[model samples]
Target: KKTPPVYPVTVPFLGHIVQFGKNPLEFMQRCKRDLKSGVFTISIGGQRVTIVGDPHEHSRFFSPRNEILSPREVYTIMTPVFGEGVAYAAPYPRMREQLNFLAEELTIAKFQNFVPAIQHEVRKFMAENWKEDEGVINLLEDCGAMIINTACQCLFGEDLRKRLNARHFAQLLSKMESSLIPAAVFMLPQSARCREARAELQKILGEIIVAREKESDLLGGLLKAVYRDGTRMSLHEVCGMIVAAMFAGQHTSTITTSWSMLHLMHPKNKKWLDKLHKEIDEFPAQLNYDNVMDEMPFAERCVRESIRRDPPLLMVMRMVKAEVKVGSYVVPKGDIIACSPLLSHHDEEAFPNPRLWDPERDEKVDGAFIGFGAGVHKCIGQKFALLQVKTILATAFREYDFQLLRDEVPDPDYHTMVVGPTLNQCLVKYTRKK
Candidate 1:
């Protein structure tokens, strides 16, 4: 009545691990190309994973069968890192409380309210760094620092920037590599790297928490709202939550902005960049920091297209809790199922000439995009991230003029859980606009 699920052929001790490890992208791509919409198993951590790439079948895992395909089940790898109260825990009551507070603080109105503060920081940074005629800047690191600083100010308060060290912030996010990598060798053992990173993160947050004791701010709001009872979150929980929040907000936005700048440097995309600059120029008050983003629809599209072309979070993981029928296969309980936005976003069915970076694309096939994910579990901070990009682009375009120093496209080799270029550099020359 039913066909058996296909599995990779094994060889000795390592089994299919070698093949899977060598070129995982090609291995997975081949599986999708050959198997179409069927279940196939690959061994990782000595366990078989039912990898799903088809969008239609992947949708079923999150839809009616979501009880089985729980995000918590899939994200177990992150539990030890993100702590017991995060999305990894998926504690409904705790999550609802956390989500409500985050939504309230990061809503459109709140984001708009915070825009002036965001503009102030961006303007200050650009003005302080502006060089006449030609200047080479590391776009990735520069933009990352800029967003990290803005996030620190907007979410934590302005003075936190001067108080906190940038290297400390960078180190906290650097922990993300080990946290996401699937290592059979390290998962079971006590990870020394994990311990050190967590401890370092805790130390930083402890200092910030001490500072917040004197004043009420966004960080203070989190402490207040997250604890409905007399009990507050443990130091570890608070540290992990804040670290994860900053990592999620800063890491991806930096890559996205870097890629956006890269695309703009292209001759074709330069036309779009000019269009974006013209749009912001139309705004009143010489496009001062306050309202430049309000005039940046084209800038919004450029950022969205960059994400589409090179999404940072290329694939998302989910696990089957029970026998879940996705297309032809009834995936058994405890099997890891994954969806690749990397593949989905480029599906010609959803996006014609899917390879092309066209910002004008509308949100027609909603869930098909999966850039911010689909449905209820979609990224809550997506709006804030977008606004950060828009604010930076608008302000920089209006305040300074820049040209690309390198003509070649930067190689996309920084592939971890997120993808960025190898050099992570966007060489540009800039001068203050007259």
Candidate 2:
């Protein structure tokens, strides 16, 4: 048996808890600063994660190492939320087929057709969250609702959107959030909370699918595909896919969108909004998906910067299934490896003044910057997610001008496996444009 690498030890069990708790982004930054280019073990609870921050090493490790790195190991954490084989754990060939289908369906044309729905949702949210007079509203919660509604409408169709229970919708989201927590609360296993929530989700999705079978909609299209004997997915399988896709698509967009909005409103970056508004207006058919995406270069830059600055998921884990060498270190068979984007994104050489919110710097980097990640298992919904974010911003700014009110910088709440601003505390104010 080969010995895996180890570095300086802190406290046991909760070794990096305080360091990570105070500031996760900085904690990873500190690790990169101290570790340089060597393997080290950090114990979070009982799990030992071997940290790797070197870009060349990451490239080599991720390349052509099928046996050594299974995406299943990285995505296993999602099983509790996405259920079995939802994220990427399904048989590789099958998962690839499903992902390609999803990507094709969410193309620029289909995504654009959903703009009216996006506009409607944002308008509804603004009308509800904003005061007639003038007051600060938490943009974080507001953005989450807007993005969630938009995602539901686009992916599931407007009919299902109308019929689904709001409480169940919220509970489903809560479970997605809860799956990310490191606390033993998640280990409680199939508790009353989990059962109730899962039941509600299934009920809501089941009713929608049943109704759709008799009608024409996106869900209908999917159901038809599943029913066709020649097709790849079965009805139960299709349902699982929907459950997986819906939560994965919406939750990530919601948190990332909220952060993008917060960063856009930051005093120094306020001018970016005017630029965005100008870009939206200058583009033809501002509500149209292709047009919105065409004008989204700046918005995309902001999104990339935001995610880079504060990635939703802190780190991803993988197991080395075979021998891999990087510098002087050789990772033996079956060693667990972790990659922290928090470290990679902040590489001063790659991103100058990495802490600053400069969209221009991001635009300059192009695709080298991997917030949605890189390589074969990159986020399949990256295009759809970008379209959703741009659609929301275009729709909102087209109808109104907004102002943010939070003097305090938004802090990450570790309530979920992913991190975002505390709920209902990050405020904004908006007024209708003449």
Candidate 3:
């Protein structure tokens, strides 16, 4: 008969949506403090929501299999962007198969010449865009461009790279992203541009899938994926998987890189940046997969700390399918349970001086840092995303020195599906290294 304590919602119809929208961290903190409990329930637009704020009880939320705590209902919105009948939209039996296909596809075993490929694209992008010795530029905007460019340049096969230009697709991405309806494309429908642009990409992917059967790349791997039932993925299905794979890392890398660069640029963290320099400096002028993957522990820490400090994907929720024991409370079926990076990473016991950026800092509690998440909901692109961030940091910082154009690092804006430093505060000045 015991349930998580509920935080009173003052609004009649909205049910804490406004308070949450304005500041989730503050709102949640207030609830935890007022209710005198870490694990508690809150109403989000009249939906029964529970947050696993305690790091110790995270196991309660993560340990359960998808059968016990299904994410299909919560992630149903991913269909339009990821593709109809793919991923979360697919039935549970089929979902794991499709997911496994992508996991195998993106594994480090297949990361042939990925470092050099990414480095080449980064260098090319910097040379073209960051041309001047000293110029102020928008850091968030630039990182966003680089995320797409590098992925497009490397993930696709050589033939596809030759034909599929990143900028053209970026423009298409721009057109699709114009309305800014949570770009997650969840709940709301997609614009015509979003649909046709994706359709157009599929047309090309289908052509090359048939044309280059021997090509060993993302598109090729998807085509090779055989469902447990021996059925092949249709063109639409392949396109959605490709979109899902591509979309998964794009926002994550962009924001993580942006935040990492911001912290490294801030004068307060010069020691950590210096340590990162020491780690990356030992490597040759050109980096390889081994260098970033095997070496560069400090650089990895900086990236990790940045994510721990300000995660891009803030909240991961699952719809409960069965009554589950979480500490003293029992979360009933039909309740939505969330494990939040923003909330958990800031747990005072887990992260003292939670606001401070410390690359060398470790989580006080085991597994407190849920940046890439854990358990079944774990991010497939964590390793791959880290590769991009480290490579970009090493390459970009090696060639140019950056200056934070403001007095302090910008505030984290929580208004978006993926969070980052405020765009207005991302002003940066770069000078080519002598």
lDDT of 1 by residue, 264-346 (tens): 76675677877877777766434333463455667888888888867777667666676667677666776676667676666
RMSD of each: 3.6, 3.5, 2.1
> Which residue pairs collide, candidate 1?
135-429
Candidate 1 local lDDT, residue 283:
66
Candidate 1: residue 390 lDDT (0-100): 79
Candidate 3 off by > 4 Å:
173-193, 213-215
TM-score to native of every candidate shown = 0.84, 0.86, 0.95
Q: Rank the candidates by lDDT, best first.
A: 3, 1, 2
Residue 267 lDDT, candidate 1, scale 0-100: 71
**1-434: candidate 2 lDDT, tens digit per residue:** 34445545566666566676777666666766676643455556445556666555556445544456766775665555555655466666666667666665666657656776666666666677664745566677667677777677666665776776442465576664564556431125654455456667667767766775576345555554532236656544565666667766665677788888777766777788878777777654336655756657888887777777767766666677776766566666655677766667676766777778787775233343666766665777788787788777666667666666767457767555667777766767766676
Q: In order, how many clashes per candidate?
A: 1, 3, 0
Off by over 4 Å in 1: 1-27, 38-46, 64-67, 90-92, 158-162, 165-167, 175-216, 226-231, 284-295, 363-366, 406-408
RMSD of 3: 2.1
